[PDB]
Copies of this chain bind each other. A is one copy, B any other.
Amino acid sequence: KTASTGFAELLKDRREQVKMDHAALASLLGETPETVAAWENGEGGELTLTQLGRIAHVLGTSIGALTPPAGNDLDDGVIIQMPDERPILKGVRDNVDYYVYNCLVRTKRAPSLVPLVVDVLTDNPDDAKFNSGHAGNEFLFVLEGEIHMKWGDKENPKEALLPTGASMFVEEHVPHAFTAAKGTGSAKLIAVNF
């Protein structure tokens, strides 16, 4: 139910898995057997990131293997966000907005799902600044106006115009950048990273 109960359980499981008793694990970590027992009784909440790294190391695993998954924030399998709930970040250069990011619903049950409405306020394709690609795949859909999309190698990009209603898939690790089509003022798209 918490980081430390989650840890207590996963710690005990791993330790038993590798056939160590409290004393063996304690001897590897500069603690008493009693202290290791306390962790497994849910008293590990004040362990530091550094100490957790050492525990994972001596158990031949990662901190992730010893900590609980993200958790469940769903309501019988669903989560809903109303339109006046959306968080917003602005893409700014020299106190000029280039993008506004309208954050749509997210869930701990699918952490890589990041959907956004992007207001695209630059209509100078020169302004497009390449990222370096995502860990995951991405789906885009043009809601308003027309997008000038660039992808691949920032030095010699591939480019395309996407009118309203166009849809696109960008594979993991593919660098990309976009603005509105030259001189057309502004555009809007939905981007779903997953």
> Which residues in A have some Cβ–Cβ distance to B below 8 Å?
2-4, 7, 13, 17-21, 24, 44-50, 52-53, 56-57, 60-65, 67-71, 73-83, 86-87, 89, 101, 103-111, 113-117, 135, 137, 139, 141, 143, 149, 151-152, 158, 160, 162-171, 173-174, 176, 190, 192-194
Contact = CB atoms under 8 A, between A and B. Distances in A.
Could you say how many copies of this chain the assembly holds? 4
A160 to B, nearest CB: 5
Given A3-B53, A47-B48, A171-B109, A18 B114 contact: yes
Contacts of A141: 104, 115, 190
Given A81-B168, A107-B169, A49 B47 contact: yes
Contacts of A110: 137, 169, 171
Q: Which of A75, A80, A163 has the most CB of B within 10 A?
A: A80
Contacts of A115: 139, 141, 167
